[PDB]
Swiss-Prot record, chains A, B, C:
GO biological process: protein secretion by the type VI secretion system
Protein name (Swiss-Prot/TrEMBL): Type VI secretion system spike protein VgrG1a
Function: Part of the H1 type VI secretion system (H1-T6SS) specialized secretion system, which delivers several virulence factors in both prokaryotic and eukaryotic cells during infection. Forms the spike at the tip of the elongating tube formed by haemolysin co-regulated protein 1/Hcp1. Allows the delivery of the Tse6 toxin to target cells where it exerts its toxicity.
Family according to the record: Belongs to the VgrG protein family.
Gene name as annotated: vgrG1a
NCBIfam families: vgr_GE, VI_Rhs_Vgr
Length: 627, 627, 627
């Protein structure tokens, strides 16, 4: 008979003067309510945000309900006979546009993610009628977007759409990815067409009709890149053919958000089907009260036999007026044999540039990586994690030089700050592109005092202190240049062929304990001037062959009171306290001049203070002073 | 009586056939004029771009002026007696959309910056009626945007809004941030409401009314990151409560562009109040003449008690029709107790990627940094500076590896070219992410000739030349590999524990001056074959203990004419010019065979060319040839 | 008389009930057809996507053709005798919106590029009427955009625009850049104006007329940066003056995408002329059937003398009404003396973040660069190249540190993966900003096992194996620290002034072949304890001066059976098998006590196992074990 209102503040209190609105798959509905009352001050705030329910009486005594909430309301001028109120009726997912956040999801399918969101925000009136399996997303990020947009975006991408089901007292969001999740309203399995020139038919029926066709792209090719399998062919392609001319235009995109060719196939398919869903659209007008968006119906009685087929309502317009009554609707539908998909109309969030982040990992670790050198980080905007190994997925890190098991590598450690870039601005594809210092992670050299210094200084792990490091430092200060190398422990310089060391001026070497040198073949040393050797212990030279000691002026052998002097002019002096010259065989003592014995011609040789144990020791000790 | 005109080319020349237009807080007004005149060729260009005043005669003999600039004009069809002319009036800030530029502002508050813009372009008709304190911006950039847009988004961000004051001969932009900067028109302190059912009512009044309410977000949380205080909690939150349900939806954003929590608080508050300003708005229609955007008035006589309150005119529409006189206005108002703020409508400029820049500093410096290793640069687009130390703010510089007071460091120098990235595309957040070479800053090695070389080569400063550098160079050329290390001055290799040097083939060492080595404990050297030593000066060995010299075949002591030969078979030859064997005590000479004196059995020993000073000298000089 | 239709299915089948059309320079034409037919179900797919043309009865029996392609079609309600059908006609370039791709163009002018696109997609119905010379683009990229958008964008940038020429059987795309490429329709060289107050003139004529003038910017300054000439002044400026007030507002942009100042001039000029093309627009209404977009005509008979001038039809609107014949045309025109240019309305594609790519070059190379260190890469999305040296243009590569002929040097090699950034997101300005390891390009050390290792490992080229590399490795493992250096061939350490080596504990040195050392001046060595020397060959000392050998306790000379012992207490023992003491001159043998001969006082001195050839040999070879 009419439309009855069932709402807060009383049902009969508000009479529906008229209603106008729209339904559509994958979208939020909207209805304009023009309501009138007797109460001139009917509290708008007691309706705003509240559940509403329209009761349309249908044939057979059944009823169609329109449940939702008052997104917007208004009080308007009216008449002494009535108070005027208006309301914008919207579905509860609309409230997800009133809230926003940033958030990382890990190891979840999109269906699960959506459910997660609804649960997080206290919603329960929804139902999963999905039939297709979905890939598990390792890393998916909500970023600078509303919760609604996030959801919508995911659904358009994954090829999931939704429609609503109404119960007098609640509003249900049904998820679907198949025609099988759709239903025909009771008594509206098929709706007849009655050529409007015949006059208005009392039975619910159609009277207007239009079919539109448009040239769409015939093929979509996607691509991506998996660094774990670099040479793999990830190119995928989906094709849909149409009978008309010029139906073979290709599309190509990159990246397609997949690592498996199977996933790529699905995504390509979803997108090209969404496009192809626009190839043919059918518009009908009638007074049909039971059919809305998401419903299935079969057209009958239309002259052109071809059009008497089952359709899926993808959208609808409504117009209701009441007097104190008419009901008009317009349907927008497609051939039910077509695979309905949503068009990518929801904006995609883009990271507009680099962000800083902190490297994180397990509480007992210092360094945390894997076989690819990837690391995990904590983004400053992530207010929901615990700054640990569950913060984010593994992230590849740019190095100074990469190559086939060679190049440079300087793995970042926990607590260090890094610059994160995103491939094509996509929040789901982070990569490390630089290391930075901050007030905690300070620079290795005091600045600007040491601004002329550069280099690399490492740090022992685990438990290293400021004194535990290896470094290579370069000092460019004019007139005080330095190349400094420090090894915390051992140092090993291996040269496979020839090595060379050249020092323009002074070279010092100091070794705390033992030195061992071994020369493969020959060794030649030359000193242009003096060569001093001080030995605090004992010295032992052992030559397998000939040991030639040649001097150009004088050879001296001194040992306490034993003194031997060999002069270049042939003078040989030998002094001691006693001597024992012995031959097991014959001995000759010949002179060219006179041989004298006990004559007084020979005497002690002045050792000049040499060969004195105490003095010698002092000289050695002077080379090794205490610290 | 009517609306009069005061403009270039006359006042009574053009007659206002009709006017329609709009006013709005924080926005530019627009008035559409339909003007007519007896002069069929009234030069459009002599009106275009010029000041123009309209004058609405008001009650009490006062006048409402509309002063603006003919942004656009047109010659249209008209009558015989009066030809048609059209004009669009816009406020002088509109002209700031006709100009664009890239600029950097430093150490200035937004109020100051905006005023600076107006001064730069010759504008003076504005007034500062701001009251709250504002943050001083260290660095703020105008980039690829119009001057208008620049100041527009600054005002949105800071919660600054404006309205205009009209004087017969000029147009004033008044800056505002509180209701205290707003005024009620003379005689329009309060405006009565009368029912539209009365048809015509002569006194200025309202007759239409509508109040709209909409569900808005309830809370806003902002965040940011200050590298100078990394662990600080910059998270801030602002909350505004409404009496209706579903008023508790949170928003979250990042970065909020602040470093103090106080500042963040105020930015959050501004944003959420802007949103809340849309929660409730009132639409009024009436014939008031003096009330426009930015004016205050109190509604009176409206049946519903709580509608009779003070209002702020947010926006307004006007309609004027004059027969050759009707007047109508519609107002968009809010409750004057609410804090009016502008919505973020103005597009924000985003740097779409990296840019190159040159490192700059003081004329007498080559390196210019601070305690965090930051540097200053000159952007290529900044054509309004002197490439000096004031060209930009300090910029964080990425490094190869950054840790806690350790890591790698290579500070940019003046004149070097770098790659600058912007955090989240924000022009106000530059960061250096790479160093590059150019035609002036040439590469270390000639390419592609030395493309197989890699490494690091420094440069002495200040005042260094190409010959003053330290380097570590690697040559990968197959079959000619090289590891080259060079120190401009001093080199210091320090190993805490064990060091090792292994050379597969030959090793050469050359030292220009002195060499000194000290072995803390023991030293052993082995040479598989020959060991030659040349000493240009004197050699001095001093062993505290035993000095054992072994030979496997022969020991020779040669010194000019003195020759001593010790053979492994026991033969001891001692030849000299003379000798002096002496004991201070007893001396024994014993033979197993005969002891023959002056027998002729002994003779000179062949020195074999050894022991000759000149020869020895020559050999040393051979080892040390001239340069 | 009427409009005839030349179409598929038969020209006598469709009846054009009415038509609405839109034409415009640089844009796609659109015509709305409303037509009917005796066939109640005339196959829409047999018209969709096909060629079709209208034929408007012109004076002299000539015809105006409207050739185009049915972009869209629809079947609607109609008459009973004639069913209703609708169709939208569009230009064949419209089909380029149905396809997309990514693609690199190199060394081609824009005219050439556009033609290449048409050829690639099988189109030939176009003409080149360009009069201006164009710049050859080194590198130009189609990216994530439709083919139409790509060429549209290029034309806006270059100041190229187009219009269509209709032939009975085809739709011609004419490229143009000067008024000389435009034409006046036969009999429509000049079109007369008659006042609308005359009701109607039978001859084709104009009757409505408007002129609009608007304030536009007066000057444009562009800028860019050429790294090959860093100090160049690429700043350019173009100025256009208008006679009205305030015609002097400057614009500034960066980058202008040019390297020559001459080219910059052209681009600046194009942009400002496009802006200035909107300064003055003229609106005309008439029944002129022969004039369309791109045509030239002179206005005649307009009362204002100044308007009787030549015009260029920038755009047009059409209305056709038939009956079972009305015609109306509205034109947008500009003064033909103005330089028409298109306004930047086509969305410019932008890279939203970094991408990865592979370094490529010639088949026989490992390294491929130039004098600036630039490289060639292969982008993953460029499915049309051959992964060789022609895959892209030269790209500058970021380095760790870049200075004036000094700094770091690490050149990417063929097959390595790098991170590519785009300056300002412009696809035509790539730059390498990182280097990344992948499943083929593996990390230098096994991870996470060696996560505590860092450093640089190089690789010999060409043809180097895993064992052919130079490296510097640092090990931070706590308690196992190591600094490892490895030279595959030669190593050369050159210190200009002083060098120092300090080792806290032991130092080992092993050299495979010969060692040679030369000390410029003095050398001092000290050993706190023992000093052992083992020589497998012969040892030879050549001291020019004094060779002083001191011992604090004992000197021993041992060789085979010859033994000499010098004790600190003055005891000198000399033992051999035989001896030959000889003086060329005099000899003295003196004692203080007794001088005994053959008394038995002296005896053989123990060698204590020293001086044995076999033993010595064993000791030497023990230091040099096999292999």
């Amino acid at each position: 008979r009419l439309v009855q209102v069932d709402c807060p503040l009383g049902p009969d209190v508000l009479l529906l003067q008229r209603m106008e609105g729209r339904e559509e798959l994958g979208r939020l509905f909207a209805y304009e309510l023009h309501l009138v009352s007797e109460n001139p001050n009917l509290p708008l705030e007691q309706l705003l945000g509240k559940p509403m329910s329209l009761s349309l009486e249908l044939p057979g005594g059944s009823r169609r309900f329109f449940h939702g909430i008052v997104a917007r309301c208004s009080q308007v001028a009216g008449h002494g006979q009535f108070a005027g109120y208006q309301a914008t009726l919207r579905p509860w997912p609309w409230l997800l546009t009133r809230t926003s956040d940033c958030r990382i999801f890990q190891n979840q399918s999109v269906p699960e993610i959506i459910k997660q969101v609804f649960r997080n925000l206290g919603f329960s009136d929804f139902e999963d009628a999905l039939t297709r399996p979905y890939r598990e997303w390792e890393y998916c990020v909500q970023y600078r977007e509303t919760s609604f947009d996030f959801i919508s975006r995911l659904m358009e991408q994954e090829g999931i759409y939704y429609w609503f089901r109404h119960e007098q007292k609640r509003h249900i969001l049904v998820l679907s990815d198949a025609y099988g999740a759709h239903r025909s309203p009771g008594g509206y399995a098929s709706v007849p067409y009655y050529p409007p020139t015949l006059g208005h038919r009392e039975r619910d029926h159609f009277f207007d009709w239009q079919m539109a066709r448009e040239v769409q792209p015939g093929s979509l090719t996607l691509n991506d890149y998996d660094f774990q399998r670099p040479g793999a062919r990830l190119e995928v392609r989906s094709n849909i053919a149409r009978p008309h001319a010029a139906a073979d235009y290709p599309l190509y995109d990159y990246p397609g958000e997949y690592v498996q060719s199977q996933d790529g196939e699905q995504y390509a398919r979803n997108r090209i089907e969404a496009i192809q869903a626009q190839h043919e659209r059918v518009r009908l007008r009638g007074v049909v009260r039971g059919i809305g968006a998401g419903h299935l119906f079969r057209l009958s009685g239309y002259p052109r036999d071809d059009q008497n087929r089952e359709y899926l309502v993808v959208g609808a317009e409504y117009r209701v007026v009441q007097e104190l009554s008419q009901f008009e609707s317009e349907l927008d539908c497609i051939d039910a044999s077509q695979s309905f998909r949503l068009l990518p109309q929801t904006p995609v969030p883009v990271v507009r540039g680099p962000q800083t982040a902190v490297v994180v990992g397990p509480k007992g670790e210092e360094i945390w990586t894997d076989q690819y050198g990837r690391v995990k980080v904590h983004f400053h905007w992530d207010r929901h994690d615990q700054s640990n190994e569950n913060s984010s997925c593994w992230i590849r890190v740019s190095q100074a030089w990469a190559g086939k098991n060679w190049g440079s590598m300087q793995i970042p450690r926990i607590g260090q700050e890094v610059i994160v870039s995103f491939l094509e601005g996509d929040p789901d594809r982070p990569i490390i592109t630089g290391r930075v210092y901050n007030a905690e992670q300070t620079v290795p050299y005091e600045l600007p005092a040491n601004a002329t210094q550069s280099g690399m200084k490492s740090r022992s792990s685990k438990g290293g202190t400021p004194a535990n490091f290896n470094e290579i430092r370069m000092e460019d200060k004019k007139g005080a240049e330095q190349l400094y190398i420090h090894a915390e422990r051992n140092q090993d310089n291996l040269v496979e062929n020839d090595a060379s060391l050249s020092v323009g001026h002074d070279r010092n070497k100091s070794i705390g304990h033992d030195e061992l040198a071994r020369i493969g073949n020959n060794r030649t040393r030359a000193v242009k001037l003096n060569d001093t050797l001080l030995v605090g212990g004992a010295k032992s030279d052992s030559v397998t062959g000939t040991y030639l000691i040649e001097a150009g002026a004088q050879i001296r052998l001194v040992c306490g009171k034993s003194v031997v002097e060999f002069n270049a002019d042939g003078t040989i002096n030998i002094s001691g306290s006693a001597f024992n010259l012995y031959a097991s065989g014959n001995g000759n003592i010949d002179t060219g001049g006179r041989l004298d014995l006990n004559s007084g011609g020979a005497s002690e040789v002045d050792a000049k203070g040499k060969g004195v144990q105490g003095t010698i020791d002092g000289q050695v000790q002077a080379m090794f002073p205490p610290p």
